[PDB]
Design a protein around this ligand. Structure first.
Ligand SMILES: COc1cc(/C=C/c2ccc(O)cc2)cc(OC)c1
Length: 275
């Protein structure tokens, strides 16, 4: 699939940089014809077939194809796609309130503040999983706020760079996500489905409630080893005032066997969440 090959600079003006990654950079931008503001994600293309630098066109097209399907208040929307010899440029909805993660370091949240964020995450994931889309990269870095100055900010899931359609219940494709947040099946290179997202939600919930990462080791290999062994516990120093029901929610997500892990529908019906 080909994208618009006019120079993006003829239709947009770029501004502040919002984020920078392995093969991508995101810049605030403004469409000249409407004055509306967006985030322009510049993705570096592979220059040769056998190269390790840049993103393969297959991977870019998958990300674009998933973004084109989604429209939900808790997920970023795709406006336009451009490309040139060096980059594909996604013009994405502007989410300017900062990471949940950057917001995290400002406080540990109360259970109400955590569930208010968490319910929005679950609603967005429920939408994705209803469409058989696994995100595969859920972490605080990929959860951003529309406005960070209100008491209950609205969040949006960003960065569909690892997302896959799961039309056969599982995919076998290798997901190099962030060790602290990936499920054991990712660590062990096993078939992957929607269940991997539910584990990541469990990790996110643990961090929201405590300010601590449940599997984080001193090195990436230690973290991965801890994940595969389900080597975590609720430290009393961090969880002494957290409800047992919140702990129960997490415990039913941080489950090695994906088949026994809570699904997105289970998580919305769990007594900690269900109104
Ligand atoms: C390109 O690497 C990064 C991209 C992004 C994308 C941020 C972003 C911000 C606003 C949007 O509307 C869309 C993406 C974030 C990062 O750390 C937070 C790293």
């Amino acid at each position: 699939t080909v994208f618009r090959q006019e120079n993006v600079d003829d239709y947009y003006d770029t501004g502040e940089e919002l984020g920078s990654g392995q093969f991508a950079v995101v810049k605030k931008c403004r469409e000249k014809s409407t004055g509306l503001q967006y985030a322009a994600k510049f993705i570096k293309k592979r220059r040769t077939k056998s190269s390790r630098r840049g993103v393969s066109r297959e991977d870019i097209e998958r990300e674009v194809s998933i973004l084109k399907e989604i429209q939900h208040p808790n997920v970023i929307t795709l406006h336009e796609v451009y490309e040139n010899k060096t980059d594909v440029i996604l013009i994405l909805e502007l989410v300017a309130g900062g990471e949940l993660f950057d917001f995290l370091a400002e406080k540990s949240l109360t259970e109400e503040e955590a569930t208010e964020f968490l319910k929005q995450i679950l609603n967005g994931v429920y939408y994705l999983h209803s469409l058989q889309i696994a995100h595969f990269d859920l972490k605080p870095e990929n959860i951003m706020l529309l406005d960070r100055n209100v008491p209950k900010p609205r969040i949006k899931i960003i960065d569909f760079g690892l997302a896959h359609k799961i039309d056969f219940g599982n995919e076998f494709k290798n997901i190099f996500g962030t060790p602290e947040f990936v499920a054991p099946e990712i660590v062990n290179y096993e078939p992957l489905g929607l269940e991997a997202d539910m584990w990541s939600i469990g990790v996110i919930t643990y961090i929201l409630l405590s300010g601590a990462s449940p599997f984080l080791g001193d090195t990436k290999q230690e973290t991965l080893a801890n994940v595969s062994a389900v080597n975590y516990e609720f430290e009393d120093e961090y969880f002494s005032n957290t409800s047992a029901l919140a702990k129960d929610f997490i415990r039913r997500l941080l489950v090695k066997d994906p088949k026994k892990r809570m699904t997105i529908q289970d998580s919305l019906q769990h007594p900690w969440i269900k109104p």
